[PDB]
C-alpha cells in the first residue's frame, strides 16, 4: 500500500518515533506497512503493532461510549426531538471503529497467525484476534452479533489451550490473555461467574509459581496479577 516503498527497518524506526511523539495513528500505519512486507515479527515488533492499534481503537471506543450515552438519553421519555444528527455521528464513529478492527483482523488472517508456530507468538496473535472481535461485539446490534461473539470466544479459547500447555502460569502473555478473556465473559458473554472463576484460578496459579522467578520477572508478573485482583474487587 502507501508504505510499499519504505524499507521495513525504516518503518519500524518510525513506529518507535511515532510512539514517543504520541502519534498513534501514524504508528499504526507504519506497523501495518511493516507487517505487509511479509516477514514474521519479533517480540518487540509484535508489541509495537499491538500498542499502536490498542491506542487508536481505545480512543474510538471512548468516543463511541460518549456518543451512545447521549443517544440513549435522547430516546428517554420527555426528551425533546433533536433530529438524526446524534445517531448519524455515532454511526460515523462506529463505522470507523469497525474499519480499524477489520484492518487488524485482516493482518492477523493475512498472514500473521498462520506463520506463527512458537507458542508465544501464536498466543499473542490469537489474543489480539479475540480482543478485536470483542471490540466488534461491543457495538454489534444486528443478526451477526452471535457469530461475532462466537468468533471472539473461539480465538480466546485456542489461545488459552496453547498457553496452558506451553507457558508457565506466571508468563505475562498467559496472564494478560486470561485477564482479557475473563472480561469477555463478564461484559460480552453475560457469564459473570465464569469471569470470576477464571480470574481467581489464574491469580492463584500464578501466585504459586512466583518463587521460580527473578526479581525482574517477578515485577512483571505481579503487575498483571494486580489487574486480576482489581477486577475481582470490582466484581465481588
Amino acid at each position: 500500500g502507501a508504505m510499499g516503498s519504505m524499507e521495513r527497518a525504516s518503518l519500524i524506526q518510525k513506529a518507535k518515533l511515532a510512539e514517543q511523539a504520541e502519534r498513534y495513528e501514524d504508528m499504526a500505519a507504519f506497523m501495518k506497512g511493516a507487517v505487509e512486507k511479509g516477514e514474521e515479527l519479533s517480540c518487540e515488533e509484535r508489541n509495537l503493532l499491538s500498542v499502536a492499534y490498542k491506542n487508536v481503537v481505545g480512543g474510538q471506543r471512548a468516543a463511541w461510549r460518549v456518543l451512545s450515552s447521549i443517544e440513549q438519553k435522547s430516546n428517554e421519555e420527555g426528551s425533546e426531538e433533536k433530529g438524526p444528527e446524534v445517531r448519524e455521528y455515532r454511526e460515523k464513529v462506529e463505522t470507523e471503529l469497525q474499519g480499524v478492527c477489520d484492518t487488524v483482523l485482516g493482518l492477523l488472517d493475512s498472514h500473521l497467525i498462520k506463520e506463527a508456530g512458537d507458542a508465544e507468538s501464536r498466543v499473542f496473535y490469537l489474543k489480539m484476534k479475540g480482543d478485536y472481535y470483542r471490540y466488534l461485539a461491543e457495538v454489534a446490534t444486528g443478526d451477526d452479533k452471535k457469530r461475532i461473539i462466537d468468533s471472539a470466544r473461539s480465538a480466546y479459547q485456542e489461545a488459552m489451550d496453547i498457553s496452558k500447555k506451553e507457558m508457565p502460569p506466571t508468563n505475562p502473555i498467559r496472564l494478560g490473555l486470561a485477564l482479557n478473556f475473563s472480561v469477555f465473559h463478564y461484559e460480552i458473554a453475560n457469564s459473570p461467574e465464569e469471569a470470576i472463576s477464571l480470574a481467581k484460578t489464574t491469580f492463584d496459579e500464578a501466585m504459586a509459581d512466583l518463587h521460580t522467578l527473578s526479581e525482574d520477572s517477578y515485577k512483571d508478573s505481579t503487575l498483571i496479577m494486580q489487574l486480576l485482583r482489581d477486577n475481582l474487587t470490582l466484581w465481588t
Binding site: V183, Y186, L227, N231
Partner: peptide, 5 residues
C-alpha cells in the same frame, strides 16, 4: 470499566 491489557 474493568482492566484489560
Amino acid at each position: 470499566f474493568p482492566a484489560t491489557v
